[PDB]
């Protein structure tokens, strides 16, 4: 219920002043957000100021997308951690991909919720 699913979003998925963007960043990171027990198979981290996250969900920085999702208007500095191995237990290795392009959300009551990992899936 309350924020908590919007501050979720936040520790999985934002990182306003990354550093470098490497791989031994996302392997860092991951661990710092608790993503790796088990390790998460791909994530992405949105970068910059939270005002225009949060924006994406007013048609301030949004447009509908899909059955109930969000585009975002403006594009966004982003850093893609893919794991790399076989096994969901650490060590997680992760290959970093760092990026700039909109990104799809979920919202509610305003606010970022959920991020549409599958236009970061580059098969």
Not at 49 to 58: D, F, G, L, Q
Not at 91 to 115: D, I, K, M, S
């Given at each position: 219920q309350?924020?908590?699913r919007y501050?979720?979003?936040?520790?999985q998925?934002?990182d306003?002043?990354?550093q470098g963007?490497?791989?031994?960043?996302?392997?860092?990171?991951?661990?710092?957000?608790?993503?790796?027990?088990?390790?998460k198979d791909?994530?992405?981290?949105?970068?910059?100021?939270?005002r225009?996250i949060?924006?994406?969900?007013?048609?301030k920085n949004?447009?509908?997308?899909?059955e109930?999702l969000?585009?975002?208007?403006?594009?966004?500095?982003v850093?893609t951690?893919?794991?790399?191995?076989?096994?969901?237990?650490?060590?997680?290795?992760?290959?970093?991909?760092?990026?700039?392009?909109?990104?799809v959300?979920?919202?509610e009551?305003?606010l970022?919720?959920?991020?549409?990992?599958?236009?970061?899936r580059?098969?």
């Amino acid at each position: 219920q309350d924020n908590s699913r919007y501050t979720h979003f936040l520790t999985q998925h934002y990182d306003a002043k990354p550093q470098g963007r490497d791989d031994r960043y996302c392997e860092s990171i991951m661990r710092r957000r608790g993503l790796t027990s088990p390790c998460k198979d791909i994530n992405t981290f949105i970068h910059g100021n939270k005002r225009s996250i949060k924006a994406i969900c007013e048609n301030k920085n949004g447009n509908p997308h899909r059955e109930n999702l969000r585009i975002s208007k403006s594009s966004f500095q982003v850093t893609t951690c893919k794991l790399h191995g076989g096994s969901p237990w650490p060590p997680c290795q992760y290959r970093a991909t760092a990026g700039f392009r909109n990104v799809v959300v979920a919202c509610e009551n305003g606010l970022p919720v959920h991020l549409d990992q599958s236009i970061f899936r580059r098969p």
